[PDB]
Amino acid sequence: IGRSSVRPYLEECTRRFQEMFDRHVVTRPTKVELTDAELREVIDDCNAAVAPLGKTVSDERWISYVGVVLWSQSPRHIKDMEAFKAVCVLNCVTFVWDDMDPALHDFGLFLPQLRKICEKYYGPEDAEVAYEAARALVTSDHMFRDSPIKAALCTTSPEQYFRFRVTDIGVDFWMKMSYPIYRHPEFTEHAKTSLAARMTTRGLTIVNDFYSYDREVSLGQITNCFRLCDVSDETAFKEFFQARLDDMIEDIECIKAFDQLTQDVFLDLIYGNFVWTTSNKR
């Protein structure tokens, strides 16, 4: 990767992200703890869904995927643990699908597994909303592989890039499968209009992109907001990073105008995602 690396800024940016969250969010993420029985159930369902694909995945690997759900949901407000388990399974199986060679992507085998998961854990209406979101995300992933549109949106400006990431980073899917956990009519509506996703996209994506940059550029991946700046130039990098923190701050201050429960969930998502992303486990 040569000088296209954020390694020189890794510690300072980690410190600044945390400082920002401490100043602006205050409430520290907590990890939801599943019983051994609940985790086993989650993992069994994950294994079942990827079995048709001939994937064997260890518990260790599943638990490494699931941690983002354990850290980035909002334990204060959980009301439906069946829905919580659905989010665990769906998150994990999607990560596995995403890590597969796309030439092995058999949608005909995988999509009915997603449907079977949703029907197990959600009521009829919610199962359809979660399933459609999952189907929309994997379909978009397939459409945007080596696509000129992805190139155009990702390289034009931060505005076009984040617009693309509202779907691509997975947060619209996340919101559409997570609202049944909270049974909160306002949150449910913000999830369904995708306003929830639009509010949280930058705080999730900027953190994810920062910590994935070196790995991605080494693999020739273009979907990272830091590709819009000359990371090798400390002055240009610091300018850009400050602009991204300011974006995160503006979003967070606006999130604080939503009703209390909704803003707890949105902020626990953005902050919890950062805690997980930086964890030794991750």
Which positions make up the binding site for Mg(2+)?
98, 208, 212, 216
Tokens encoding 113: 């597994």
By CB under 5 A, residue 170 contacts Na ion:
no
Partner from Na ion, a second copy, none binding residue 192, C-beta < 5-8 Å depending on class = a second copy
- Tell me, rounded to whole angstroms, the distance of Cα 121 from its chain centroid: 21
Which residue number, 157 or 279, has a Cβ lying nearer to a second copy? 157
By CB under 8 A, residue 156 contacts a second copy:
yes
For residue 45, the one-letter residue type is D
Q: Which residue stretch of 27-35, 76-84, 150-158, 244-252 sits at the interface with Na ion (rule: CB under 5 A)? A: 27-35
Tokens encoding 16: 């600044």
- The residue within the footprint of a second copy, chosen from 94, 167, 273, 277 (CB under 8 A), is 167
Taking phi first (over 0 means left), then psi (-120 to 50 degrees means alpha), and beta for anything else, what does residue 13 get? Answer: alpha
- CA dihedral angle for residue 142, residue 48, residue 132, residue 185, rounded to 10 degrees: -140
Tokens encoding 217: 């550029």
For helices 36-50 and 107-121, give the axis angle rounded to 10 degrees. 150
Question: Between residue 28 and residue 87, which ones bind Na ion under the rule CB under 5 A?
Answer: 29
- The residue within the footprint of a second copy, chosen from 132, 233, 234, 239 (CB under 8 A), is 132
- The residue within the footprint of a second copy, chosen from 192, 238, 261, 278 (CB under 8 A), is 192
- CA dihedral angle for residue 91, residue 94, residue 98, residue 102, rounded to 10 degrees: 180
Q: Which residue stretch of 9-17, 21-29, 85-93, 162-170 sits at the interface with a second copy (rule: CB under 8 A)? A: 162-170
Distance CA 62, CA 65 (A): 5
Asked if 178 and 206 touch (Cβ cutoff 8 Å), the reply is no
- Measured CA angle at 132 (ends 127, 136), to 5 deg: 150
DSSP state of 280: S
Handedness of CA 161, 136, 265, 254 (dihedral sign): positive
Q: Which of 248, 249, 272 is nearest to 76 (CA)?
A: 272
DSSP string computed for 262-274: HHHHHHHHHHHHH
The label of the residue with tokens 């399974």 reads: 89
Partner from Na ion, a second copy, none binding residue 29, C-beta < 5-8 Å depending on class = Na ion
By CB under 8 A, residue 159 contacts a second copy:
yes
By CB under 8 A, residue 172 contacts a second copy:
yes
Nearest approach, Cβ of residue 191 and a second copy (Å)? 10
Summarize the annotated binding site as residue ranges. Answer: 98, 208, 212, 216
Nearest approach, Cβ of residue 9 and a second copy (Å)? 25
Nearest approach, Cβ of residue 256 and a second copy (Å)? 8
Q: Which residue stretch of 60-68, 137-145, 216-224, 262-270 sits at the interface with Na ion (rule: CB under 5 A)? A: 262-270
Total number of residues binding a second copy (CB under 8 A)?
A: 35
Nearest approach, Cβ of residue 193 and Na ion (Å)? 23
Q: Which residues are at the interface with Na ion (CB under 5 A)?
A: 29, 268, 272
Q: Which residues are at the interface with a second copy (CB under 8 A)?
A: 128, 132, 136-137, 139-140, 143, 148-149, 151-153, 156-157, 159-160, 163-164, 166-167, 172, 186, 189, 192-195, 198-199, 250, 253-254, 257-259
